[PDB]
Symmetry: C4
Subunit: 103 residues, 4 copies
Amino acid sequence: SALHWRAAGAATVLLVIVLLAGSYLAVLAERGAPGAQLITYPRALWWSVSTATTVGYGDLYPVTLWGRCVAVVVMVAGITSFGLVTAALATWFVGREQERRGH
Amino acid sequence: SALHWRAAGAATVLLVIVLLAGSYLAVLAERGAPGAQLITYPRALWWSVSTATTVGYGDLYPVTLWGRCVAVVVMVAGITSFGLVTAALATWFVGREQERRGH
Amino acid sequence: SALHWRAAGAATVLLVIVLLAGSYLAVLAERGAPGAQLITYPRALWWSVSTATTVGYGDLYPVTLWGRCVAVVVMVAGITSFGLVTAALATWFVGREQERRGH
Amino acid sequence: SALHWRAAGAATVLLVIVLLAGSYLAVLAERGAPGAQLITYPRALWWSVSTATTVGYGDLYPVTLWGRCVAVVVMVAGITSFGLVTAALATWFVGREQERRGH
Ligand SMILES: CCCCCCCCCCCCCC(=O)O[C@@H](CO)COC(=O)CCCCCCCC
Ligand SMILES: CCCCCCCCCCCCCC(=O)O[C@@H](CO)COC(=O)CCCCCCCC
Ligand SMILES: CCCCCCCCCCCCCC(=O)O[C@@H](CO)COC(=O)CCCCCCCC
Ligand SMILES: CCCCCCCCCCCCCC(=O)O[C@@H](CO)COC(=O)CCCCCCCC
Ligand SMILES: [K+]
Ligand SMILES: [K+]
Ligand SMILES: [K+]
Ligand SMILES: [K+]
Ligand SMILES: [K+]
Ligand SMILES: [K+]
């Protein structure tokens, strides 16, 4: 099992862990802030995933410092995780082309 | 026809299929939810494509569990599909540079 | 001048052309649609760039079929253009590591 | 220390500098525009980071020419910086696969 595939797998599991951890921590950070909407777990998970994919509909978002810090972590984990999948695909293609070239 | 170009082509066709399937399933999942707006097919397709590209204007979004699950599938298919195109471009450039180096 | 750098340069010029063309065509497609906001050129250019980078604040967006089609073109051009820059960076790094390995 | 890792490190520091500089300049550009909301530094930094990651919730955005120009710089720096991290990961994977192939 090549490194890039293992890394891709691990990245996926870690992202899921971050999305989960982020939804809990977001609710923890946001309750107590008048007007906050990221305060129940199910929609917080929806918020986490739509932030990690960087879609950001804006239907939900953090208003506190720690909620936003949590958000940045979720964003970075999502961007780098998917970026890593891209990197693994590149490695796969590069390898196949070398073979196709007799190497 | 190198693998990366075939993969890029296939990824494109699959994405189109997902955007189509996602618009139908989104409407199916969202009707029945008071207040939902992702309920007619044309705008649902607009929603699907703007989600797959991860643009997310927020003019439309799912409010139900299954609509959101459908959304996650659309997001992932879009991100990985475009990511794959990037990976194919990298393979193309890597190959040309090797040649430019006499290999 | 290696291919990837030339491609990166060309991609940048083309993107600028698309952003420009997209702002004109968006206004052309949207005027005539009651309620449309993407109807003056300066903000249309702001809309084009924030769509191409896939940021999508949602302060502006197309409501017509052709405005949305124009949007999809802008999105794709932005994603693939930046993706190509990424691919060129990968080629640059791959080349330097080979050298660092005595190849 | 291979180039790609140094580049990745430098890209990260530069991005942080841009996010910081962007929040100051955004407030500078936006105050004086009736209705503008990107006018206090803490939320401006939140705006900068959520723009650089291209998340774009839409809770905050620039309304002036220079605020939007600043925004474009932030967007580009974010996209290219994360793109570079992706490129570095690809180089790392490519290198490990070559070794795994006895090269
Ligand atoms: C540490 C933080 C952990 C957070 C864990 C969240 C646990 C929530 C229970 C799970 C589902 C509840 C369903 C429900 O009745 O809610 C629906 C109401 O319409 C839709 O809600 C939602 O928006 C849920 C969508 C979740 C999408 C997840 C995509 C993951 C790739
Ligand atoms: C399985 C799910 C399938 C969903 C299929 C959708 C079929 C809809 C018929 C198609 C067009 C109708 C036009 C119309 O009169 O609508 C216009 C009204 O202003 C604009 O609407 C729209 O927003 C359509 C924009 C579609 C963009 C698609 C981009 C694809 C890359
Ligand atoms: C084919 C379509 C072509 C469209 C061309 C657009 C021409 C507009 C003239 C240019 C500037 C006008 C300034 C003004 O007085 O407007 C300011 C008002 O606050 C800010 O406006 C704006 O939002 C302009 C922001 C533009 C950002 C462009 C970023 C490019 C990478
Ligand atoms: C040149 C421009 C420089 C701009 C520098 C900004 C300096 C602000 C001081 C820092 C924190 C203040 C906290 C506070 O009391 O504010 C909180 C109020 O709820 C949350 O605010 C916020 O939204 C801050 C979130 C910042 C996230 C940064 C993520 C970086 C990767
Ligand atoms: K995005
Ligand atoms: K976005
Ligand atoms: K958005
Ligand atoms: K938005
Ligand atoms: K919005
Ligand atoms: K809104």
